[PDB]
Amino acid sequence: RRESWAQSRDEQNLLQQKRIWESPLLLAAKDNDVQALNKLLKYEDCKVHQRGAMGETALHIAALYDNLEAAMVLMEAAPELVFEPMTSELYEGQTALHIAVVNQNMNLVRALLARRASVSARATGTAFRRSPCNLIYFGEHPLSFAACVNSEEIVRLLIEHGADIRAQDSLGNTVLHILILQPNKTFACQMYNLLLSYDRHGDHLQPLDLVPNHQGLTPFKLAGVEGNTVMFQHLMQKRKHTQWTYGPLTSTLYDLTEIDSSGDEQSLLELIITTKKREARQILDQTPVKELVSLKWKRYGRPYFCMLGAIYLLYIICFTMCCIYRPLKPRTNNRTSPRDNTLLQQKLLQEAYMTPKDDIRLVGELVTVIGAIIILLVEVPDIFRMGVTRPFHVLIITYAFMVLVTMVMRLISASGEVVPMSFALVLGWCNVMYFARGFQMLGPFTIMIQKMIFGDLMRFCWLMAVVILGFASAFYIIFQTEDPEELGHFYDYPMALFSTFELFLTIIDGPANYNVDLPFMYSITYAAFAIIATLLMLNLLIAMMGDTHWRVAHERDELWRAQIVATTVMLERKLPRCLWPRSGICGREYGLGDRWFLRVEDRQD
Amino acid sequence: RRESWAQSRDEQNLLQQKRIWESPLLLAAKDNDVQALNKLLKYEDCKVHQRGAMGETALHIAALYDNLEAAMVLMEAAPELVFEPMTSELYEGQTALHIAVVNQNMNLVRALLARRASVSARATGTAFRRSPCNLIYFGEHPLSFAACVNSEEIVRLLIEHGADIRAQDSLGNTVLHILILQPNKTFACQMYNLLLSYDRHGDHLQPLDLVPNHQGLTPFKLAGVEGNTVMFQHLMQKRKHTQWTYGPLTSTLYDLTEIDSSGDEQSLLELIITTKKREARQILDQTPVKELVSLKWKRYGRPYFCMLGAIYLLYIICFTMCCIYRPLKPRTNNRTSPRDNTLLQQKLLQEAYMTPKDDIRLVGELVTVIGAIIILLVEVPDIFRMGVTRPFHVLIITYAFMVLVTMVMRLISASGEVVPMSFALVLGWCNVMYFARGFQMLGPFTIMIQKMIFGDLMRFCWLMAVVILGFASAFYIIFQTEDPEELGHFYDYPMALFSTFELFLTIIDGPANYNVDLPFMYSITYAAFAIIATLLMLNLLIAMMGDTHWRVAHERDELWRAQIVATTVMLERKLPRCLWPRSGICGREYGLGDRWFLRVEDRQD
Ligand SMILES: CC(C)CCC[C@@H](C)[C@H]1CC[C@H]2[C@@H]3CC=C4C[C@@H](OC(=O)CCC(=O)O)CC[C@]4(C)[C@H]3CC[C@]12C
Ligand SMILES: CC(C)CCC[C@@H](C)[C@H]1CC[C@H]2[C@@H]3CC=C4C[C@@H](OC(=O)CCC(=O)O)CC[C@]4(C)[C@H]3CC[C@]12C
Ligand SMILES: CC(C)CCC[C@@H](C)[C@H]1CC[C@H]2[C@@H]3CC=C4C[C@@H](OC(=O)CCC(=O)O)CC[C@]4(C)[C@H]3CC[C@]12C
Ligand SMILES: CC(C)CCC[C@@H](C)[C@H]1CC[C@H]2[C@@H]3CC=C4C[C@@H](OC(=O)CCC(=O)O)CC[C@]4(C)[C@H]3CC[C@]12C
Ligand SMILES: CC(C)CCC[C@@H](C)[C@H]1CC[C@H]2[C@@H]3CC=C4C[C@@H](OC(=O)CCC(=O)O)CC[C@]4(C)[C@H]3CC[C@]12C
Ligand SMILES: CC(C)CCC[C@@H](C)[C@H]1CC[C@H]2[C@@H]3CC=C4C[C@@H](OC(=O)CCC(=O)O)CC[C@]4(C)[C@H]3CC[C@]12C
Ligand SMILES: [Ca+2]
């Protein structure tokens, strides 16, 4: 199932080595063999256009095994074999110019250009596309191939012979975008300068560092999403304008145009926080950005997050107050058939709103219903307007349904409404833990409780729900032939599981009676449940929750700053303008244009 | 709100760059432009006194962007432009001599001194004052500016031209005080020697290392408060007088005048322990001081701290003894209206002191009242005599009120006095934890209990008082329609919070009855409270109290020595002389003057 692509790849690469061993022409191109390559091309031609296992000529082989002399003898006998690409599906459109560039063969690339090779050869195969299957993402063009391998010789050689500097691949990446997607980040900085040096701006469109992809990303914005910090410090030096320097002081000044959210729908700060990478959050510490989100939060962002956290805390007190005064008449019927098993003595009211203390509650209930529709008007026209659904969004909409269920369940006088009022008194209060991110020291406590549930408890609840089902289905059998008035823990099977879950966690004690003879098999089975499940499997979980606290408190300040960017972006697109002005100091009154700058000085030495 | 100071700073620094771009004269001073600076000053003058955005001439710009030749052409056309300072509020009083010194421009400072520049220019701006807003604290004078940048050339150059070595800024700091407030501490040691070398003592007042500030600190005492250890080892070598050396032995001898508390109101040991810095306690390990407070404590300081801890331990036993024998007659009235809810059967006496076993208690009560006025006579005329109130002071005055409340509450025969007797039996005993600092190994256990309450429990009680209010207001609703004779934990709402606080910490068990049918929603809600709140949020707090024990026991001996200095200073000003003599061996009988020395020998090699 969807794994034969790596199986057919390995059969095709072995099919290449079979046809390279059958033909005497092509076996005389692996190891050069100029004595026989003369003699084979002397016979008549012996089929100079022999296609191998993957669409290849005899000149592709001599360029691939780095045979300079075997191609010089071949090109003098080749009428047009520089022109033909490979005609495969795996390696499609790869001319012989591509192969001679990647191997840094400087003498062969001078040869193929001399016989008029096309430098715009679209190598549109499937072994060159951006994929986790392919270990290389070089591009499509020989200028793109020469840039990724860090060869400063062929790059000068191809531009002189007319290579296009603005060519794009299938993913729309210009030749400066692929250099950001390379592992050797230091060598990609020099190639970023050398390729942009061949940009004579002749009233063409945007000058090669602003050309977007099919997604819309510039090379600056692509270096932010991909977590490329070395190609971010180097690309920022075009944008800072250093003012006066005064001994050790240096009053630099950053441009801040593609970083801050303009009238354009996206910004750099929105792309960093919503991407699926982890190294992209490392770029949120650099000197243009760290002084931006800590200036956008100290002013304009903390007072709008505490006013939004004091209305909600005076809302969920208004909901708790109008819910512990719920109606509750004294009874209707007699004590039903179970003798003393059924203790319940209220059976809440039907439809009486008299007695004016209930009219005070009616004002306190309509606030909690209006307050639960406004949640469904700023959350439901977000997901059903953007489509994708990527987690306190889902704990504030679930609260918003459980109030709206209770309204429908009361107007029709349905009976049991203590169940929607128990998913709203605990989902409603435990969302005040969301507002513990405007405080730095209370911030990543919400991170630890996520990584202890979904990372250390969902991985060890499957080895605890097996021991608990093992010993509760053994405790039930032992106390199945007993009298469940004394020692009545395990009286039926749904209670045997709940009263073994509690004995696991050591919250209830552990049963004994001392006035009766407990069955013999209980004293052995419980003395093996106190060992395998109380001190040895519970105290393995508490140790797993003691190095998830450690590896989060070790990076306390980095997890908080990613909670401030994600809050400020959420609070900027919803809360409108004239209450949230642009950050920084504008141009247009200091002779700088329509750009929004942000200066900062730092003592260096 | 009080953040426009950094906003008006950034607009003013951009207003400088606008007026530097409008004037052809001043734009010909950034990049020197000697072709046009000749042509502009040839026209007529074209306003040689043009003030820019911040009070500046055209010569300030040529000194700020390090333009030597643009000022040489300008000063020959400048009639008096060396004289005028900046006339701003930000950069006020800064002449052009200040700017040429900071940039280490040696050729320009020779020029401005040749045209008779004043070297006593009070640069009394607001961008030079000591503040966390300003990244530099250089001073006011060009001799003060040359000392901070570590230039040994201009410092010789200014003293030859008559710079005052004893000048003071607005904060009273002489030129040796600012060198202690510099980050490069190694380079500030050489400048301390070179500036003090120009001190020919000519029957002037105290020789430049004893001149106080407006606070009263000498440069030696300022190096103690500011935590500057490198400027403390270097400044101590003036004070030690080395005696005989005998192979590896070396019997050095320290001066100990500005360290130990003289008749002067302050000492070095009082300033270290009462300042708001943390690096100031690092200086309390150096060789003059560490052998002082460990000689002031082994004798004279431990026997006066254990006699003061055995009177108090025989006082709080006298208070416990006279409080569990409190009067308690057998009743007055009947069992009041609640059936068996009100179990109480004493209702303490009014005013009977007969039956001579009560006359023994009266002697035991007057000791506990006299003992609680003496606390209010050595503590209340301290805070209301010094004004500022900066924490076992507040747990010994709170004990002193709760005894004095109980005296007033008994003489008027008021009813409920079990509440002031319960803030005095627990505040009174838990102050014997104060006297666990005369013991080295019991010492910083009092530090750990502070940093676990005010540092790890006041930060995580706000994420626990939300879950506890969430589940107690859900447990109350479920057991609101029940019979609270069986399973009567949550019978009213103040008890639902207390019986969920206890279920959180796992001190009471967890309710069950097994003879009745508990409601269905309880078995789900409690099985989610045992997970989110017993093993996952409690065992996150216990891990937070396991790396606060670690980071205090790692520095066990440093926290104890700061508890001995703070005890010895407190016990020296209250307990008078003739019971606490001066430490060290005096002069005046060995030909050394009126100084109090302390010798120590150490094997070196
Ligand atoms: C009748 C009166 C009482 C009206 C009551 C309205 C408020 C109690 C509600 C209405 C809309 C709610 C907001 C709707 C959306 C959000 C975003 C939501 O953010 C997330 O889910 C996470 C995003 C992030 O991590 O930044 C958190 C709750 C919050 C602020 C809600 C807080 C409480 C609000 C203001
Ligand atoms: C921290 C570790 C132990 C997590 C492991 C998860 C499970 C082992 C626990 C967590 C939730 C528990 C359940 C939560 C609630 C109930 C309902 C309880 O009784 C009922 O309310 C249903 C009976 C009825 O139908 O009336 C029976 C046990 C059961 C299934 C519990 C069985 C054990 C469960 C699956
Ligand atoms: C009738 C008889 C029993 C008189 C009883 C008097 C003592 C029981 C009281 C009176 C004054 C009290 C003292 C008043 C002041 C202080 C300083 C106080 O120091 C601090 O608060 C912290 C200072 C530091 O950290 O060094 C600690 C308690 C102590 C020694 C008190 C110890 C107990 C004393 C001697
Ligand atoms: C009747 C009920 C409400 C009991 C009330 C008890 C609290 C009011 C008391 C009991 C124990 C006290 C604590 C005991 C010990 C310390 C350590 C103490 O730490 C230091 O003083 C260390 C610094 C130093 O070296 O002086 C600070 C006060 C504190 C937290 C105390 C704070 C107040 C507490 C919690
Ligand atoms: C270690 C963690 C859990 C600290 C978190 C702090 C709070 C969650 C705790 C600490 C003190 C507790 C309070 C201490 C004492 C009381 C009084 C108690 O009943 C009373 O005495 C008042 C009722 C009446 O008026 O008669 C009700 C619970 C309450 C408020 C407790 C509720 C829970 C509190 C606020
Ligand atoms: C009636 C019974 C079933 C009670 C049901 C309780 C649960 C449905 C609730 C109560 C507390 C909740 C948790 C409270 C806090 C968090 C942390 C929260 O973490 C973050 O959002 C961190 C990331 C960020 O910074 O936004 C994720 C949800 C989670 C696990 C919640 C998941 C759902 C929980 C377990
Ligand atoms: Ca128990």
CB A26 within 8 A of CB A70: no
Q: For CA atoms A195, A198, A199, A204, give the dihedral sign.
A: negative
Q: Round to whole Å and give the CA distance between A354 and A363.
A: 14
Which tokens go with A205? 């469109």
- Give the angle subtended at the CA of B193 by the CAs of B192 and B195, to the nearest 5°: 70
Mutate to test the interface with A, among B1, B2, B9, B14 (most CBs of A within 10 A): B14
Mutate to test the pocket of ligand 1, among A297, A306, A363, A434 (most ligand atoms within 8 A of CB): A434
**Any binding-site annotation on A557?**
no
Q: Round to whole Å and give the CA distance between A230 and B226.
A: 39
Residue from B28, B85, B468, B528 nearest A320 by CA = B468
Mutate to test the pocket of ligand 6, among B478, B526, B532, B540 (most ligand atoms within 8 A of CB): B532
Q: Give the structural domain span for A19.
A: 3-234
CB A231 within 8 A of CB A180: yes
The three-state (H, E, C) secondary structure of B375-420, written as one string: HHHHCHHHHHHHCCCCCCCHHHHHHHHHHHHHHHHHHCCCCCCCCC
Rg over CA atoms, chain B: 36
Mutate to test the pocket of ligand 1, among A311, A382, A431, A447 (most ligand atoms within 8 A of CB): A311
Residues with CB under 6 A from ligand 3: B 308, 311-312, 315, 367, 370-371, 374-375, 378-379, 392-393, 396, 434, 566-567, 570
CB-nearest partner of B477 from A418, A432, A495: A418
Q: B112-141 in b/e burial notation, b at 16+ Cβ within 10 A?
A: bbeeebebebbbebebbeeeeeeebbbbbb
* DSSP letter, residue A296: T
Q: Round to whole Å and give the CA distance between B474 and B435.
A: 46
| 3 state DSSP class of B572 | helix
Question: What's the gap between Cα A103 and its chain centre?
Answer: 36
* Contact residues, chain B, for A590 at CB < 8 Å: 14-15, 17-18
Residue in the structure block whose two tokens are 């322990």 = B273
H/E segment holding residue B253:
strand B249-254
Kindly report the protein residue whose alpha carbon is nearest to atom 21 of ligand 6: A391
Residue B222 neighbours by CB distance under 10 Å:
23
* Contact residues, chain A, for B497 at CB < 8 Å: none
In chain A, which residue's Cα lies nearest the Cα of B12?
A590
Kindly report the protein residue whose alpha carbon is nearest to atom 13 of ligand 1: A375
The three-state (H, E, C) secondary structure of B31-70, written as one string: CCCHHHHHHHCCCCCCCCCCCCCCCCCCHHHHHHCCCHHH
Q: Round to whole Å and give the CA distance between A552 and A455.
A: 13
Do strands A596-601 and B585-586 pair parallel, antiparallel, or not at all (unpaired)?
unpaired
- Residue A132 sits in a domain whose CATH number is 1.25.40.20
Residue B72's contacts (CB-CB under 8 Å, 6 or more residues apart) are B111
Which ligand is nearest the CA of B310, by number? Answer: 3
Which tokens go with B107? 């050729």
Distance B506 CA to ligand 7 centre (A): 10
Q: Residue A279, CB half-sphere, CA atoms under 13 Å: how many?
A: 7
Shortest Cα–Cα distance, B71 to chain A (Å): 17
Which tokens go with A295? 């200036």
Q: Round to whole Å and give the CA distance between A162 and B558.
A: 72
CB A161 within 8 A of CB A202: no
* Contact residues, chain B, for A429 at CB < 8 Å: 466-467, 469-470, 473
Distance B454 CA to ligand 3 centre (A): 24
| Cα distances (Å, whole numbers) of residue B160 to B105, B110, B119, B153 | 18, 12, 11, 11
Q: Round to whole Å and give the CA distance between B433 and A294.
A: 43
| A429:B469 CB<8 A | yes
Which region, left, alpha or beta, applies to residue A439 given φ > 0 means left and ψ of -120 to 50 means alpha? beta
Runs of H (alpha helix) within A262-323: 268-274, 290-293, 303-306, 316-321
| Cα distances (Å, whole numbers) of residue B207 to B204, B238, B307, B342, B379 | 8, 13, 45, 81, 41
Q: Name the E strands within A183-341.
A: 245-246, 249-254
Which region, left, alpha or beta, applies to residue B407 given φ > 0 means left and ψ of -120 to 50 means alpha? alpha
Do strands A249-254 and A245-246 pair parallel, antiparallel, or not at all (unpaired)?
antiparallel
Residue A138 neighbours by CB distance under 10 Å:
22
Residues of each annotated binding site of B: 509
Contacts 24+ apart (CB under 8 A), A183-189: A184/A150, A185/A228, A185/A230, A185/A231, A186/A230, A187/A150, A188/A150, A188/A230, A188/A231, A189/A230, A189/A231, A189/A234
Which ligand is nearest the CA of B522, by number? Answer: 2
Please name every residue paired with B252 in a beta bridge, in sequence order, or none if there are none. Answer: B600
CB A37 within 8 A of CB A74: yes
Residue A283's contacts (CB-CB under 8 Å, 6 or more residues apart) are A223, A224, A227, A228, A229, A232, A272, A289
Kindly report the protein residue whose alpha carbon is nearest to atom 28 of ligand 1: A396
Q: Round to whole Å and give the CA distance between B227 and B175.
A: 19
Residue from A188, A144, A284, A172 nearest A227 by CA = A284
Instruction: State the angle between helix axes of B394-411 and B357-373 in degrees (0 to 180), rounded to the nearest 10.
Output: 140
| 3 state DSSP class of A599 | strand
Kindly report the protein residue whose alpha carbon is nearest to atom 8 of ligand 3: B312
Residue A224 neighbours by CB distance under 10 Å:
28
* DSSP letter, residue A315: T
Q: Round to whole Å and give the CA distance between B138 and B130.
A: 9
Residue from B224, B222, B226, B225 nearest B209 by CA = B222
Please name every residue paired with A252 in a beta bridge, in sequence order, or none if there are none. Answer: A600
CB B328 within 8 A of CB B348: yes
Residue A566 neighbours by CB distance under 10 Å:
16
Q: What is the DSSP string of A529-541?
A: HHIIIIISSHHHH
Q: What is the DSSP string of B189-224?
A: HHHHHHHHHT---SS-SS-SSS---SS---HHHHHH
CB B178 within 8 A of CB B208: no
- Give the angle subtended at the CA of A405 by the CAs of A403 and A408, to the nearest 5°: 115
H/E segment holding residue B367:
helix B357-373
Runs of H (alpha helix) within B412-519: 445-453, 467-478, 493-505
| A251:B13 CB<8 A | yes
| B509:A506 CB<8 A | no
Question: What's the gap between Cα A394 and its chain centre?
Answer: 18
Q: Round to whole Å and give the CA distance between B288 and B255.
A: 9
Q: Round to whole Å and give the CA distance between A205 and A316.
A: 56
Residue B602 neighbours by CB distance under 10 Å:
11
CB B213 within 8 A of CB B173: yes
| B65:A244 CB<8 A | yes
Rg over CA atoms, chain A: 36
Residue A339 neighbours by CB distance under 10 Å:
7
Residue from B188, B110, B121 nearest B149 by CA = B188
First to last CA, chain B: 62
Instruction: State the angle between helix axes of B467-478 and B493-505 in degrees (0 to 180), rounded to the nearest 10.
Output: 120
